[PDB]
């Protein structure tokens, strides 16, 4: 009816339920896996993804939004297996994930051409399947808004205006990229309430986070567990403050957890260093209980994990 | 017994025959093709490659060296089908093709880890097959010698010293990257005579070219047909001058032709002006006939397309 699901019939937003807005079933570099497949283990990746999703469902997680796209190794078929194995509601997306330049393929390609790719995934289907994308993902990091990163941003705007699917972003909390993303998108006619500025939970700077929420976009406190960016307790302080300041209407919380990720930084011997208890359920284990014993009632929790996702997708 | 061939028993370097040292059966962005396969057509690509290679064999070509690696869309299985259909001697390689940064996978990974990937393709095989790489390909362009670009160059060095295979590079003829690639490789202990500094035919600055050759490396006048880099006539004038000054034993000539390329710059609309008569048989139609009628004997032609490739793979 509204929100497309992987390996399932579309559902109305009122059916989305308790959602984790930013989680990855699996992440890898398309090029390396294609060129050195001996580096990967399809079987193990599947076990880890199925196990995480099951544990999350045991906590009452009803729907999981996965922002894995070009550049992160999106694969609907793999996502489709995980769905059959768990019965989870999985929202797949489209888009391009880059930090500096686009693949050489886009050399001399218009912004419209890029947009046509997103729209294709949205209206036609993903990677040859009839599984449709329910949102579009774009990114920017340390390098800032480069010429190509902007191409992609604009392309997203075009897709959104044509399909009305929301936009989720990856940004660097310390260099105003998120703010710039929101600025460019809203200028292109994109409803701020259809944007989720991501990874804002990576900083203490409350003024900056409110600045973006005030503009009318959702704020992503979406890396709980990734201590290397910001410890759990400090994220909790921030999240609590935002809540006490009445910003639940714009808050979205998730882990950005990678059930499997090929990045050299995700090596086991580093897990303890700056990502000890990083998982897809840390939120039920630590964050929510912390907020509850700190005044935050159940209705605020529902707003964040149910209402917000619902508005975002309607 | 010396040079590995795709879908064939390795051959002595002495049996290499007339060789095109730099041609591409197919080129594409892994990430793009993987996320939007609807943009590509197997059949077309296969026919184009088969047709080109056949015409090339009708002109006396025995061996084609295809430097399509990671980033360029390497695919030995596609390469095998072509060999089975043409019977051509095809040399596949390993390496990485970047201008700026490495895929995220390499974040926090040593140069040694990268080298192990090349050594894997050379010793073990490519993409789960027993076809082995005969060389390593590296690149550098406008951005110059970035940190990740340099990490690849040093990785290639390690591979060479371990496996003995030669190194083909891609460079920018105007930014000095070619000479940089040479300095680093030699400093790492790589034999200059086992390096091919490519795309030097894009410039008519003979001084810079002679310098690279004086330092013992092969010079690649390998883009005949690509007028957008440098018209055929100016390339021919350079080639001829170099030969007159006695650089035949360092000169290697090719088209760098892509039987099919996904890049928007290679659109059939921009072909009449960026590369009018650009194919894998252009040198037989223009370059070679030009050199001959200009005082270049069969001996020198044989040195460039037969002796130099032989030496390079020894
Ligand atoms: Co992100
Ligand atoms: Co090249
Ligand atoms: Fe993410
Ligand atoms: Fe090339």
Author numbering:
A (entry chain A), B (entry chain C): 1 to 314
Give the authors' words.
PLLs are natural lactonases endowed with promiscuous phosphotriesterase activity. The catalytic center contained two metal cations coordinated by four histidines, an aspartic acid and a carboxylated lysine residue. A structural analysis of SsoPox, a hyperthermostable counterpart of the PLL family from Sulfolobus solfataricus, has revealed that loop 7 is shorter in SsoPox than in PTEs; linking the active site to the loop 8, which forms a hydrophobic channel that accommodates AHLs aliphatic chain. Indeed, W263 is located at the start of loop 8, involved in the dimer interface of the enzyme and positions the lactone cycle of the substrate onto the bi-metallic catalytic center.
